[PDB]
Symmetry: D2
Subunit: 294 residues, 4 copies
Amino acid sequence: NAMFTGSIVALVTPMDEKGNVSRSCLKKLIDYHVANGTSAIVSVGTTGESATLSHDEHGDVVMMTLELADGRIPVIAGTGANATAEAISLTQRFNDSGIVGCLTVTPYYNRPTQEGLFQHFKAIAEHTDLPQILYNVPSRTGCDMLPETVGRLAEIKNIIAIKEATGNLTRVHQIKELVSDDFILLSGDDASALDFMQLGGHGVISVTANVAAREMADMCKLAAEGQFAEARAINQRLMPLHNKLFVEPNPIPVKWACKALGLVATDTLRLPMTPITDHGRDIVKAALQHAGLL
Amino acid sequence: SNAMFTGSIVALVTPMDEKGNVSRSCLKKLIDYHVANGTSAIVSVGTTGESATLSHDEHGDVVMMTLELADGRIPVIAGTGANATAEAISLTQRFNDSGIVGCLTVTPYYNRPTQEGLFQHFKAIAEHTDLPQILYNVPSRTGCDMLPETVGRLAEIKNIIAIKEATGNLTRVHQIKELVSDDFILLSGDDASALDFMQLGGHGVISVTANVAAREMADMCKLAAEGQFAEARAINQRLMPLHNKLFVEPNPIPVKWACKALGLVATDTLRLPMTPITDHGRDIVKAALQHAGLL
Amino acid sequence: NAMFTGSIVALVTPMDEKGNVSRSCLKKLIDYHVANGTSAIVSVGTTGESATLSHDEHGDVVMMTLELADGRIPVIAGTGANATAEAISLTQRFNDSGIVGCLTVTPYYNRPTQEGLFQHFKAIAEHTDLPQILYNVPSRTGCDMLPETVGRLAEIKNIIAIKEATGNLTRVHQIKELVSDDFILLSGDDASALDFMQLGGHGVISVTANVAAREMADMCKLAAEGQFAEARAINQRLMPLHNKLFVEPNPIPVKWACKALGLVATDTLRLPMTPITDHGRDIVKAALQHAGLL
Amino acid sequence: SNAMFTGSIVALVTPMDEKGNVSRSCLKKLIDYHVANGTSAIVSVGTTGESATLSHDEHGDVVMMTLELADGRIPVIAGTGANATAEAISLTQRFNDSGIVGCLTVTPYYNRPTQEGLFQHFKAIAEHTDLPQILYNVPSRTGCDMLPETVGRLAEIKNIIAIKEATGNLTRVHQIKELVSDDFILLSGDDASALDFMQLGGHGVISVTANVAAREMADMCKLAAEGQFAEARAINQRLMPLHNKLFVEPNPIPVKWACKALGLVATDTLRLPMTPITDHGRDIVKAALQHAGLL
Ligand SMILES: [Cl-]
Ligand SMILES: [Cl-]
Ligand SMILES: [Cl-]
Ligand SMILES: [Cl-]
Ligand SMILES: [Cl-]
Ligand SMILES: [Cl-]
Ligand SMILES: [Cl-]
Ligand SMILES: [Cl-]
Ligand SMILES: [Mg+2]
Ligand SMILES: [Mg+2]
Ligand SMILES: [Mg+2]
Ligand SMILES: [Mg+2]
């Protein structure tokens, strides 16, 4: 479970000017994560523009990430969908594929009941052998998967973790009370992730890790070892990035930041995501200098 | 004249058999029901039609099925919402020269674009079709709130003609009206506040309740357009338990059960992740139907 | 009931540099409201710094307002308290006093139940002959008096009106359905007040009326006569004031605006209220020019 | 040393007879209970003590009664909150040279001052006393949220020593700690999250639950201060139904009933606008007391 703990990068999907996926930028990013202690890469999640990649593109990008990784770092596939049949289909695409697990978000827009969530994730789980990381982010989905529901789903053998993005830190022990000792809790909120780990969480699926991979890996290791004062000093250096990478909707700011650091050639996104505004750019650039990255 | 875009427009359920396959015989009944009862237009494969769980192709086939069954007797508006601009375009192109009268297109959900992103999204969609576009704002589902200033910018585009405003924030009526021409159409997307929305100057409602109270909703809208607000309020009071309790569980779980209870559809089957109505919800909806004098 | 409908001013309590109440400024304000068609004056409400006037000062300021009014305009006393015994006592202070009615807010800070609200307002009502205007403003009090509770209280003979400050316009017909035809609904939210009246409300207890009394009186009359297009043209001229009088906490901006228009000598407030900041001042000044008042 | 300002501090009820008069015999029992069971300090005439419905003079008399009954056996902290700065000063001056160890002072409620207003409010209060001041942030009651930056500014004043942070927003712990010296004290004002708050670096809790579980709360706080978080969590799990259900109706309605049920007070009478616990609430609190093994 080393691959499901610590600093896991919510990896950008780098694009050329046309919005086509850039293989050479992907190679650079993956090499960067291997070199700097990132525990694993989430491919085609939220920060990877899952929304504007086709069902097919999803597949290709994950397989490209897998190929470039070449066994040097674990890859987790983003496989969320708001229709259970589509989530199953996305999941089946990666059976026997070399990915180590899947990251699967609560259905968005249609606002299912907690029983609908249970049935959704149960069906997905039953259609694969792969480890499943649940993902709760009500600010994007309009659905809040409550702890009791997480508890029910944790009983399923291949439902192994949750990415809890609410920033509501009381959830850590609410979930822990209901699940086995080996169930994995991951922060989905960079600004509160160190707090989350100090309370008993096991890592973070991180946007900040895109541009501060070594610092994020170090902070998570320090936190795992109970060296909270030391972890906090790193967290303070990164706090402006934890906040300002969301000055405009993720991943607009983090793609610009990758560009500014030389990690990707362009910060192009696909509509409806837009290029960072001047005002946002100046703010991110300042945060990057506060962190000593630029 | 703009009548196909005003009054009571039904957010039509997509009826299914027990395997979750679309039921053509049920859709025939529903459409005949709306023809017979004063419904202005049918939204096909919108939110209440389980757009989320119909494939790209099914979006197409179910809208065409509905048009074929309407047989020119009632206008049909296609739900063409997507959170990727390229997908919204593709969905919209499917209906160019189809007989549908317009498209209902929701703000991108989940990815939370900026207002400029919204502007560019809807501008691109509008530029790839001749069909009239009805914008749709529902932040409680999308995580994105399209502000009145942004609606104003979009309303300058020739084929962006209307907004389905679902927030239930009634201040939006005149905030939008202040920014748009007098022919731009405002539609409620919140049944419980829709009469209020019309009394303030709105032009109609894209309605869930209208699935099971089509004549009543059509009458209420006509009265409100005529300034007959006391008469309209009497209908609204009769319907208010439905306006609320059709959301006791996530739409369209309650309204599909209610269609079944009234004999409009054969089954109330939904596709996962939507679930059959609970006993608790069912008893509540049944009571609201009886309050409305429909059961 | 003319005195409980139309444009009712939430009157500032003007002060000197020391925070003492300025009689001469009060005279000027009251003369202004007589001359410009204001239906009534609320004395020592929220905009009048009820919070930082003593139980005694409350009394004096209301009696001074009454004396300066000299029968030319009705005066309504702010008599809200979060303890029922204190609300009773404040109310009894004005029995046989010449005030036409009282404005009484839901208890703040202690967050009573709806039954606690019912009992609070019932006791107050039973201890006076004066008309009672309920006041709901959950953003300040932490208590939301729901329509059903308003309905129950409207059955009491001297509970005659509600100042509904939520800006939630669905409340108009929710309340109307539950009360007699003669119960009075007043907006407590200037930005939405014209909407509120268009839906069937009878007036507004207004901050904007402090600096645009004639315009507010006209808009309310137009609205009462069903001349909504004409009312709307006035509302558009005033909208920047409806919003920017709250650029900093009311009544910081409106007191500066009274000062800028020559209605009061100083814009001094009592702590914890603070002088308007430069940034707020510029914004209010601009709103006043948009309205053609400055 | 700072011990009177850390650990389990009780937000003590003000016990009343059936006419709503303060009951001295009941307060004696409560205070003896807290002496006997490890409570660090007593907050007298705070939020749970019905500060809102005690007069200015009663604020004074009840705090002095409590000090007299404590008889130097447990420290007493006076609630001195007011939404007018001049009133907070007057309330605070009442205790200069009284034997109380400090004051608990809430952000002004209802009038919604700016952060600078908060700064000036608390600065003026602090300048008119030698007593240590514990700031109190509870936006759900006040309509005002004192931000961490403002707490940092105030913490520079010599006799502003602590904050009771009631938001349950656990990110505030290190946001405040980053801005204040290492001797500034952070106390939870949210029983349900208080252990989490302490695990993150908080120093204690001003607690409602401690009214009916004083020994348990004292033990949990001691364990958390010692880093014994698993042992502390076991107590927290036992108490969590109380931490929640003591707010099933507005505090202090439930906790006064619970004191009565446990024989700590003679009556659970409150002053209007607070009301006797409903049957529904009573059954819920009784069940939580039984879950905690206190009844
Ligand atoms: Cl992700
Ligand atoms: Cl979230
Ligand atoms: Cl729809
Ligand atoms: Cl919404
Ligand atoms: Cl007022
Ligand atoms: Cl409010
Ligand atoms: Cl307290
Ligand atoms: Cl709070
Ligand atoms: Mg730009
Ligand atoms: Mg069932
Ligand atoms: Mg200043
Ligand atoms: Mg009772």
